[PDB]
Design a protein around this ligand. Structure first.
Ligand SMILES: *[C@@H]1O[C@H](CO)[C@@H](O[C@@H]2O[C@H](CO)[C@@H](O[C@@H]3O[C@H](CO[C@H]4O[C@H](CO[C@H]5O[C@H](CO)[C@@H](O)[C@H](O)[C@@H]5O)[C@@H](O)[C@H](O[C@H]5O[C@H](CO)[C@@H](O)[C@H](O)[C@@H]5O[C@H]5O[C@H](CO)[C@@H](O)[C@H](O)[C@@H]5O)[C@@H]4O)[C@@H](O)[C@H](O[C@H]4O[C@H](CO)[C@@H](O)[C@H](O)[C@@H]4O[C@H]4O[C@H](CO)[C@@H](O)[C@H](O)[C@@H]4O)[C@@H]3O)[C@H](O)[C@H]2NC(C)=O)[C@H](O)[C@H]1NC(C)=O
Ligand SMILES: O=c1nc2n(c3ccccc13)Cc1ccccc1/C2=C\c1ccc(Br)cc1
Ligand SMILES: [Ca+2]
Ligand SMILES: [K+]
Ligand code: NA
Ligand SMILES: [Zn+2]
Length: 802
């Protein structure tokens, strides 16, 4: 029942039930009666015209062109241009901002986040003729060719990842629609439930700012408040006295996502929304220039996801695959999440659901997965709000439950939400200001990294998050943060020859007993690690947890062998361009040899594989790439051996026999690090031994859930991988270790038609492998630590050129 007299867009929300005057009161139905009148003035528009100059202050107007307006901080943004012969910010040549140029009483440069919904990366080039302000920010500041959103590429997961540096599985907003079985409640876009704190995990920037005594603009805007009013409110706040003025502000545009849904990413109707966005960027920058803040403020221009072409006719229906579609609830669209419609119903069975959706039609436009089998690069499993069954939907398609759902809910021509590697889902980043570099292009990066940077730009300490602090230092002219290498926790043992053959009772056999001062002196040095400079190019990986392990040297490879897990944690080898592929000689098919540097009790044994009818075994260093007939015997040590389902042996064998040699050919040598991963609780983090759910039958040999490889070479491919003088190039994958090849609909064909495709799907960052293994790679290089962190966050996507 109170008033907004003197409180328009107040910075601290008042306590109920007293009427509010902040930028969120409309959204709550709690604004004061006089809010529209005082706080949402519209009279005469947003632009000073040639006959408003010098006017007599009329308080009814949206903005002002009177003489006192500069003092009141409430001029129209073009006031100086129309009235005082000033130029627009965009018409001025851009001058490097080598230091902040701020008015007295600014403790730090303000940060302004300008986030735009559905702003696809290619808009920067394709719409460049109609966005001269955005294009000036882009070419004068720092920009990436594009920014990778998180999965699912929806609005709320992505804007909250931008604010927290966390994966949605961690922050808890895992879609635009959710059901939380613990709270027994649902989250929807439309509604009031979305405003309930318990949905929102982690610690977003504005709460981080406040706990550390940095004042934050009320970030969020009720939808009806026009963009021009949003801008003038931000400029008004920038004129508050120093003890009241916030240090960070956010502006959000519903465009071009809104129009993109109706017309498609490139519909001719899309030119106008892009013009309007630019017009708003113009207004801000002219307003900052009026305030003399245009060389003081850091501006971030940032999208949450792109937009793809999607129409009604490209819908796949679960009714065409399942009889009894009514026993399920589907969260539909560009992804699918399936649960049981009722919990008292216990004839529902997920195993049978997946089977009925697996490779059922020649042209099938979605693939079912249990969430824990999804590619690890999506990080989309460790949350009770993520349904066990998940449908990865092809770009350009929708999934729905029944046809009735589509024609009664064509209407739309664009959508988003797909796999975050998809070109059309990529978005933008431009940073402009004293803290950002001048005319700098940086490589593409993931939006999870920005929370640390925004914290850096504000002199704040980030809450723990999924960014890699320091990986984006190359954006910044000056950085608060200088990262340091984590300390090694366990140091290795270097065993010598300690055991006699006959002490081993492993049920292993080898046709080996056919073999001299020449090459026994040589193999002695091979076991001391003579060729180790060749095979271990960037130093040994550090182990960052408490464990017992051995470094084992060989002619062709080096490994860190775990006495706890009975297998290597990592194996490292170099394959030059000139190296040859040989076969496994017939007599050595089944050869496994005891390793006399490791005790029987810390060794695997061949019997358990004999007795485990579902489980076989493979090697980490591939015997196919042994450098000589003699070196080949090393490849058959029991300590190079790991458990593999026969179905996965097809995959692995093809990688080792064919793909490794191909990459060495194409890249001029490669260094390969391979190993097992254990993630039974699907949290993207290394399991301890008491978390292992599967052992090779009647033995303490744990079964990995995944196998990784990290393949490194020289970015300058004219240099060989073992002789690189410069930056490195990397690709990695995390392959799921599965007893069938149901994932690949073409598996019954030759490996040359499906294996590489599978590997591409399971591409990973070296950083993903680090979390999953507790190792730290690239410890000894000539490169700067910041450059290495960037390499570790790199993802090889196998999409074409944007
Ligand atoms: C990406 O980055 C993130 C963030 O860094 C990584 O996620 C973190 O990972 C940690 C290790 O897994 C995990 O540690 C947990 O913490 C449990 C308690 O956590 C609660 O408190 C958190 C802190 O909030 C406060 O933050 C600051 C301090 O920093 C304070 O000043 C404030 O006061 C804040 O309140 C909080 O973040 C967390 O939030 C979760 O839950 C909320 C409400 O339910 C949700 O809103 C929110 O979304 C979070 O939910 C996520 O996390 C949970 C798992 O925590 C997950 O299930 C969800 O899916 C979702 O993803 C909490 O409120 C603590 O219980 C754990 O301790 C157990 O394990 C240790 C092992 O050392 C034992 O020693 C210990 O005794 C204990 O075991 C006992 O309980 C066990 C299980 O119940 C049981 O088995 C056993 O028998 C024992 O009795 C552990 O320390 C962080 O919580 C987590 N943080 C976040 C934000 O998720 C993530 O790993 C990264 N991803 C990758 C791939 O790298
Ligand atoms: O005015 C709005 N601000 C926002 N959203 C709106 C959605 C509809 C109408 C208005 C709004 C969606 C959103 C979701 C989750 C987290 C932040 C935001 C958000 C801005 C933002 C601020 C700071 C950062 Br950092 C990132 C995003
Ligand atoms: Ca785990
Ligand atoms: K077997
Ligand atoms: Na198959
Ligand atoms: Zn949208």
């Amino acid at each position: 029942s109170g008033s907004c007299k003197g409180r328009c867009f107040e910075l601290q929300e008042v306590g109920p039930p007293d009427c509010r005057c902040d930028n969120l009161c409309k959204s709550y139905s709690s604004c004061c009666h006089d809010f529209d009148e005082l706080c949402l003035k519209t009279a005469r528009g947003w632009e000073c015209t040639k006959d408003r100059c010098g006017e007599v202050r009329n308080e009814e107007n949206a903005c002002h062109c009177s003489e006192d307006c500069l003092s009141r901080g409430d001029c129209c943004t073009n006031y100086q241009v129309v009235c005082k012969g000033e130029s627009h910010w965009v018409d001025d040549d851009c001058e490097e901002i080598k230091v902040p140029e701020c008015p007295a009483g600014f403790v730090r440069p303000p940060l302004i986040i300008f986030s735009v919904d559905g702003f696809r990366a290619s808009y920067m080039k394709k719409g460049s003729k109609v966005m001269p302000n955005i294009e000036k920010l882009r070419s004068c500041g720092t920009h990436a060719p594009y920014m990778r959103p998180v999965y699912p590429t929806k609005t709320f997961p992505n804007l909250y990842t931008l604010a927290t540096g966390l994966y949605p599985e961690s922050h808890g907003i895992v879609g635009n629609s959710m059901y939380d079985p613990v709270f027994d409640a649902s989250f929807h876009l439309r509604g009031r439930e979305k405003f309930n704190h318990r949905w929102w995990g982690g610690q977003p920037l504005w709460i981080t700012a406040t706990k550390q005594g940095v004042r934050a603009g009320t970030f969020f805007w009720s939808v009806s408040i026009p963009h021009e009013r949003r801008i003038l409110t931000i400029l008004q706040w920038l004129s508050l006295p120093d003890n009241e003025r916030p240090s960070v502000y956010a502006f959000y545009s519903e465009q071009p996502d809104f129009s993109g849904h109706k017309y498609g990413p490139f519909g001719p109707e899309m030119t106008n929304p892009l013009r309007e966005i630019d017009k708003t960027v113009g207004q801000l920058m002219d307003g900052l220039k009026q305030l003399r803040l245009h060389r003081c403020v850091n501006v971030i221009f940032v999208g949450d996801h792109g937009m793809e072409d999607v129409t009604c006719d490209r819908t796949e229906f679960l009714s065409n695959y399942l009889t009894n579609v009514d026993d399920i609830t589907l969260v539909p669209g560009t992804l699918g999440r399936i649960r049981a419609k009722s919990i008292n119903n216990s004839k529902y069975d997920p195993k049978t659901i997946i089977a009925a959706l697996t490779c059922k039609k020649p042209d099938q436009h979605f693939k079912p997965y249990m969430k824990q089998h999804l590619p690890k690069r999506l990080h989309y499993a460790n949350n009770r709000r993520i349904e066990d069954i998940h449908l990865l939907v092809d770009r350009r398609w929708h999934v729905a439950r029944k046809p009735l759902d589509v024609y009664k809910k064509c209407f739309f021509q664009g959508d988003h939400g797909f796999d975050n590697k998809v070109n059309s889902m990529q978005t933008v980043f431009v940073g402009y200001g004293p803290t950002f570099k001048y005319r700098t292009k940086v490589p593409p990066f993931e939006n999870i990294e920005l929370y640390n940077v925004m914290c850096d730009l504000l002199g704040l300490k980030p809450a723990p998050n999924n960014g890699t602090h320091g990986s984006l230092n190359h954006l910044l002219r000056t950085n608060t943060f200088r990262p340091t290498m984590p300390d090694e926790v366990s140091r290795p043992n270097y065993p010598g020859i300690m055991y006699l053959q006959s002490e081993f009772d492993l049920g292993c056999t080898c046709d080996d007993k056919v073999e001299n001062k020449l090459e026994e002196l040589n193999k002695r040095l091979h076991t001391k690690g003579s060729t180790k400079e060749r095979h271990l190019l960037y130093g040994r990986p550090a182990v960052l947890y408490r464990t017992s392990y051995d470094i084992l040297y060989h002619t062709d490879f080096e490994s860190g062998y775990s006495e706890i897990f009975l297998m290597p944690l990592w194996t490292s080898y170099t394959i030059s361009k000139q190296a040859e592929v040989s076969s496994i000689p017939e007599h050595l098919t089944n050869c496994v040899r005891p390793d006399v540097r490791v005790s029987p009790g810390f060794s695997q044994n061949c019997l358990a594989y004999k007795n485990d009818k579902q489980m076989s075994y493979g090697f980490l260093f591939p015997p196919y790439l042994s450098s000589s007939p003699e070196a080949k015997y090393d490849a058959f040590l029991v300590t190079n051996m790991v458990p593999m389902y026969p179905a996965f042996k097809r995959v692995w064998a093809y990688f080792q026999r064919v793909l490794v040699k191909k990459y060495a050919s194409e890249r001029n040598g490669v260094n390969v690090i391979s190993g097992p991963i254990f993630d039974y609780n699907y949290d993207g983090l290394r399991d301890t031994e008491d978390e292992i759910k599967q052992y090779v039958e009647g033995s303490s040999i744990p079964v990995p859930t995944h196998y990784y490889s990290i393949i490194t070479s020289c970015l300058d491919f004219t240099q060989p991988a073992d002789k690189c003088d410069g930056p490195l190039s990397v690709s990695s994958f995390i392959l799921p270790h599965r007893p069938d090849n149901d994932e690949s609909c073409n598996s019954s064909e030759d490996e040359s038609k499906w294996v590489e495709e599978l590997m591409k799907m399971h591409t990973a960052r070296v950083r993903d492998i680090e979390h999953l293994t507790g190792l730290d790679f690239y410890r000894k290089t000539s490169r700067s630590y910041s450059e290495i962190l960037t390499l570790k966050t790199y993802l090889h996507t196998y999409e074409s050129e944007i």
